[PDB]
Design an enzyme around this catalytic site. Structure first.
Site, PDB file in Angstrom:
ATOM      1  N   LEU A  15       0.822  -1.205   0.000  1.00 47.12           N
ATOM      2  CA  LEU A  15       0.000   0.000   0.000  1.00 47.12           C
ATOM      3  C   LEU A  15       0.862   1.265   0.000  1.00 47.12           C
ATOM      4  O   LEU A  15       0.584   2.256  -0.674  1.00 47.12           O
ATOM      5  CB  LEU A  15      -0.952   0.017   1.213  1.00 47.12           C
ATOM      6  CG  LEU A  15      -2.080  -1.025   1.253  1.00 47.12           C
ATOM      7  CD1 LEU A  15      -3.044  -0.698   2.403  1.00 47.12           C
ATOM      8  CD2 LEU A  15      -2.825  -1.049  -0.090  1.00 47.12           C
ATOM      9  N   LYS A  17       5.070   2.939   1.385  1.00 47.67           N
ATOM     10  CA  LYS A  17       6.385   2.889   1.999  1.00 47.67           C
ATOM     11  C   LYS A  17       6.732   4.223   2.679  1.00 47.67           C
ATOM     12  O   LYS A  17       6.332   5.288   2.214  1.00 47.67           O
ATOM     13  CB  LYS A  17       7.408   2.584   0.895  1.00 47.67           C
ATOM     14  CG  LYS A  17       8.621   1.774   1.317  1.00 47.67           C
ATOM     15  CD  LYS A  17       9.498   1.408   0.103  1.00 47.67           C
ATOM     16  CE  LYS A  17      10.668   0.477   0.479  1.00 47.67           C
ATOM     17  NZ  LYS A  17      11.615   0.183  -0.651  1.00 47.67           N
ATOM     18  N   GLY A  18       7.456   4.175   3.790  1.00 46.27           N
ATOM     19  CA  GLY A  18       7.822   5.416   4.449  1.00 46.27           C
ATOM     20  C   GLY A  18       9.331   5.510   4.517  1.00 46.27           C
ATOM     21  O   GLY A  18      10.014   4.587   4.064  1.00 46.27           O
ATOM     22  N   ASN A  19       9.862   6.615   5.044  1.00 46.87           N
ATOM     23  CA  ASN A  19      11.311   6.734   5.182  1.00 46.87           C
ATOM     24  C   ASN A  19      11.825   5.469   5.859  1.00 46.87           C
ATOM     25  O   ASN A  19      12.928   4.970   5.620  1.00 46.87           O
ATOM     26  CB  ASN A  19      11.675   7.978   6.010  1.00 46.87           C
ATOM     27  CG  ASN A  19      11.438   9.280   5.250  1.00 46.87           C
ATOM     28  OD1 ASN A  19      11.759   9.377   4.064  1.00 46.87           O
ATOM     29  ND2 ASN A  19      10.893  10.284   5.931  1.00 46.87           N
ATOM     30  N   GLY A  21       9.762   1.715   7.784  1.00 40.80           N
ATOM     31  CA  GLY A  21       8.517   0.995   7.966  1.00 40.80           C
ATOM     32  C   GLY A  21       7.633   1.090   6.734  1.00 40.80           C
ATOM     33  O   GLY A  21       7.931   1.830   5.794  1.00 40.80           O
ATOM     34  N   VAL A  23       3.371  -0.048   4.908  1.00 39.24           N
ATOM     35  CA  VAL A  23       1.983  -0.461   5.018  1.00 39.24           C
ATOM     36  C   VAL A  23       1.588  -1.332   3.855  1.00 39.24           C
ATOM     37  O   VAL A  23       1.779  -0.961   2.704  1.00 39.24           O
ATOM     38  CB  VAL A  23       1.049   0.780   5.043  1.00 39.24           C
ATOM     39  CG1 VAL A  23      -0.416   0.349   5.103  1.00 39.24           C
ATOM     40  CG2 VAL A  23       1.409   1.680   6.227  1.00 39.24           C
ATOM     41  N   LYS A  42       0.569  -2.126   8.965  1.00 42.20           N
ATOM     42  CA  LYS A  42       1.854  -1.472   8.985  1.00 42.20           C
ATOM     43  C   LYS A  42       2.843  -2.214   9.852  1.00 42.20           C
ATOM     44  O   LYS A  42       2.491  -2.816  10.866  1.00 42.20           O
ATOM     45  CB  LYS A  42       1.726  -0.035   9.491  1.00 42.20           C
ATOM     46  CG  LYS A  42       3.054   0.611   9.899  1.00 42.20           C
ATOM     47  CD  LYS A  42       2.837   2.074  10.264  1.00 42.20           C
ATOM     48  CE  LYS A  42       4.068   2.757  10.862  1.00 42.20           C
ATOM     49  NZ  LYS A  42       3.720   4.154  11.306  1.00 42.20           N
ATOM     50  N   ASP A 136       2.300  15.415  11.240  1.00 43.30           N
ATOM     51  CA  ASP A 136       2.448  15.327   9.793  1.00 43.30           C
ATOM     52  C   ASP A 136       1.148  15.446   8.977  1.00 43.30           C
ATOM     53  O   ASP A 136       0.910  14.669   8.056  1.00 43.30           O
ATOM     54  CB  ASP A 136       3.163  14.013   9.436  1.00 43.30           C
ATOM     55  CG  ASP A 136       4.180  14.166   8.305  1.00 43.30           C
ATOM     56  OD1 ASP A 136       4.483  15.313   7.906  1.00 43.30           O
ATOM     57  OD2 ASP A 136       4.688  13.129   7.827  1.00 43.30           O
TER      58      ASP A 136
HETATM   59  C1  LIG Z   1       0.618   8.748   0.233  1.00 46.61           C
HETATM   60  N1  LIG Z   1       0.434   8.205   1.602  1.00 46.61           N
HETATM   61  C2  LIG Z   1       0.468   6.758   1.826  1.00 46.61           C
HETATM   62  C3  LIG Z   1      -0.560   6.055   0.982  1.00 46.61           C
HETATM   63  C4  LIG Z   1      -0.614   4.559   1.265  1.00 46.61           C
HETATM   64  O1  LIG Z   1       0.386   4.202   2.259  1.00 46.61           O
HETATM   65  C5  LIG Z   1       0.485   4.984   3.400  1.00 46.61           C
HETATM   66  C6  LIG Z   1       2.005   4.843   3.601  1.00 46.61           C
HETATM   67  C7  LIG Z   1       0.182   6.502   3.258  1.00 46.61           C
HETATM   68  O2  LIG Z   1      -1.221   6.873   3.446  1.00 46.61           O
HETATM   69  C8  LIG Z   1      -1.577   7.405   4.754  1.00 46.61           C
HETATM   70  N2  LIG Z   1      -0.467   4.473   4.438  1.00 46.61           N
HETATM   71  C9  LIG Z   1      -0.280   4.453   5.822  1.00 46.61           C
HETATM   72  C10 LIG Z   1       0.828   4.851   6.646  1.00 46.61           C
HETATM   73  C11 LIG Z   1       0.711   4.704   8.079  1.00 46.61           C
HETATM   74  C12 LIG Z   1      -0.456   4.181   8.719  1.00 46.61           C
HETATM   75  C13 LIG Z   1      -1.535   3.798   7.873  1.00 46.61           C
HETATM   76  C14 LIG Z   1      -1.430   3.941   6.439  1.00 46.61           C
HETATM   77  C15 LIG Z   1      -2.371   3.615   5.517  1.00 46.61           C
HETATM   78  C16 LIG Z   1      -3.743   3.048   5.463  1.00 46.61           C
HETATM   79  C17 LIG Z   1      -4.397   2.874   4.231  1.00 46.61           C
HETATM   80  C18 LIG Z   1      -3.760   3.223   3.023  1.00 46.61           C
HETATM   81  C19 LIG Z   1      -4.031   3.191   1.654  1.00 46.61           C
HETATM   82  C20 LIG Z   1      -2.951   3.688   0.865  1.00 46.61           C
HETATM   83  N3  LIG Z   1      -1.920   4.057   1.724  1.00 46.61           N
HETATM   84  C21 LIG Z   1      -2.449   3.763   2.973  1.00 46.61           C
HETATM   85  C22 LIG Z   1      -1.745   3.960   4.258  1.00 46.61           C
HETATM   86  C23 LIG Z   1      -3.093   4.097  -0.553  1.00 46.61           C
HETATM   87  C24 LIG Z   1      -4.127   3.172  -1.200  1.00 46.61           C
HETATM   88  C25 LIG Z   1      -5.463   3.222  -0.450  1.00 46.61           C
HETATM   89  C26 LIG Z   1      -5.343   2.706   0.988  1.00 46.61           C
HETATM   90  C27 LIG Z   1      -5.700   2.336   4.504  1.00 46.61           C
HETATM   91  O3  LIG Z   1      -6.489   1.946   3.662  1.00 46.61           O
HETATM   92  N4  LIG Z   1      -5.882   2.332   5.862  1.00 46.61           N
HETATM   93  C28 LIG Z   1      -4.603   2.541   6.588  1.00 46.61           C
END
Ligand SMILES: CN[C@@H]1C[C@H]2O[C@@](C)([C@@H]1OC)n1c3ccccc3c3c4c(c5c6c(n2c5c31)CCCC6)C(=O)NC4
Length: 290
Positions: A15, A17-19, A21, A23, A42, A136
């Site tokens: 879903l 990637k971060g700097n 960790g 998801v 995550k 953030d």
């Molecule tokens: C552009 N930002 C990222 C988009 C992607 O992955 C991230 C890294 C970030 O979104 C908050 N992400 C999380 C980071 C930390 C805690 C929870 C989430 C998170 C979450 C979701 C999510 C999704 C995407 N991203 C998601 C999430 C893009 C595609 C749709 C769903 C989600 O559906 N629930 C938690």
């Protein structure tokens, strides 16, 4: 369930990637039958008795948060033979606001954008009541539940305010360009509910610009500070901010919206409006667009 068996979490895809960790999308499938629900999980790529202490707290926070405008917590998964902890949250198929605003740049009009603003403000007012700072806030961190419902995600940077203070000093920055943060955050690493407000103003800007790259915070600011020589961006940014320089009014952005924006950017954190004061203001503008 609150505690998900590691072995029943079937990896689907990435879903985000971060700097550090990440998801990923998984499906809790004890039978392999494929009728298990899909979730957002995550996990940290750097497990050590330090960043885990942070992750532990992050998990407790999201667990304690009960808001329609905050990504819902599902449970935890003390992973694969452990110290491999994993956070399980709901999954929102529509994705993040950022891409959504681009994919639907058309259909979306001012009142709808105000609706998201209103809801974000709400989930932010609530966080504040919990003595918590997001740190953030950004369109890339807002997820879409439905066409008329968004939520705040990623609490990996959040901080709980010590009982005796209204602010926190954190050396670690957020993940968005320096143009998203409050001056006190950038110069003295001071974050608070008032710094969340500032970044909220940037979110507002993002909404009414639909997260366009040409006129994003970085784009507008960079092409505004282009000056000195060889001077760190941070230094030149603060300088601009000190001189009263702020982001412009996004094209076709209702006047009133930009004024609230400017209010969020008061040089002094005590001059910025509270989320509870912002909410009803936005609700007016929304009900004003019919
Ligand atoms: C552009 N930002 C990222 C988009 C992607 O992955 C991230 C890294 C970030 O979104 C908050 N992400 C999380 C980071 C930390 C805690 C929870 C989430 C998170 C979450 C979701 C999510 C999704 C995407 N991203 C998601 C999430 C893009 C595609 C749709 C769903 C989600 O559906 N629930 C938690």
């Amino acid at each position: 369930p609150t505690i998900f068996e590691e072995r029943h979490l079937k990896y689907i895809s990435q879903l985000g990637k971060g700097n550090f960790g990440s998801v990923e999308l998984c499906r809790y499938d004890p039978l392999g039958d494929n009728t298990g629900a899909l979730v957002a999980v995550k996990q940290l790529q750097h497990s050590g008795p330090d960043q885990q202490r942070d992750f532990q707290r992050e998990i407790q926070i999201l667990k304690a948060l009960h808001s329609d405008f905050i990504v819902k917590y599902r449970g935890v998964s003390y992973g694969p033979g452990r110290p491999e902890l994993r956070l399980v949250m709901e999954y929102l198929p529509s994705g993040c606001l950022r891409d959504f605003l681009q994919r639907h740049r058309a259909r979306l009009d001012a009142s709808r954008l105000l609706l998201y603003s209103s809801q974000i403000c709400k989930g932010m007012e609530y966080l504040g009541s919990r003595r918590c700072v997001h740190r953030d806030l950004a369109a890339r961190n807002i997820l879409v539940e439905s066409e008329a419902h968004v939520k705040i995600a990623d609490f990996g940077l959040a901080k709980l305010l010590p009982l005796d203070k209204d602010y926190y000093v954190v050396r670690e920055p957020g993940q968005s360009p320096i143009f998203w943060y409050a001056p006190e955050s950038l110069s003295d690493n001071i974050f608070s509910r008032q710094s969340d407000v500032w970044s909220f103003g940037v979110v507002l800007y993002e909404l009414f610009t639909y997260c366009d790259k040409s006129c994003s915070p970085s784009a507008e600011f960079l092409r505004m500070m282009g000056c000195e020589r060889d001077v760190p961006a941070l230094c030149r940014l603060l300088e601009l901010l000190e001189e009263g320089q702020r982001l412009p009014a996004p094209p076709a952005c209702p006047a009133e919206v930009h004024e609230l924006m400017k209010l969020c950017w008061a040089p002094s954190p005590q001059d910025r409006p509270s989320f509870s004061a912002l909410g009803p203001q936005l609700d007016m503008l929304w009900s004003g667009s019919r």
